[PDB]
Symmetry: C5
Subunit: 30 residues, 5 copies
């Protein structure tokens, strides 16, 4: 129930961190 | 549904990782 | 749909992409 | 300790590793 | 094993690959 909500929330955080990594790499390569 | 949302976020994560992978291919280039 | 099978399939692709990333990074570090 | 909790723990570990990777890159780009 | 265990196992592989990636980056300050 709420554990699925915890899993969803962690995946959103993972997504957000990956976006940050992508942006740093884009600036480096750009 | 929560399972569909989880699936949707994972698809987004896959897409971001593809972008990261292509950028690294360029950097290693 | 079969949401759990879709989730499994997406995770397999994520694994594959990450393995490619690790290999590219190995070359960069070399 | 059910399978969902185990999955949650692994995702939390993934999140933390990604944070570390981002933290290192933030330094590299300066 | 069942579908949730298959998913857990793929997540473990993802974690492990990310740890490898992190390991390479950690060397710079380490």
């Amino acid at each position: 129930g709420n554990i699925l909500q915890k899993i969803e929330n962690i995946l959103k955080k993972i997504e957000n961190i990956l976006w940050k990594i992508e942006n740093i790499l884009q600036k480096i390569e750009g």
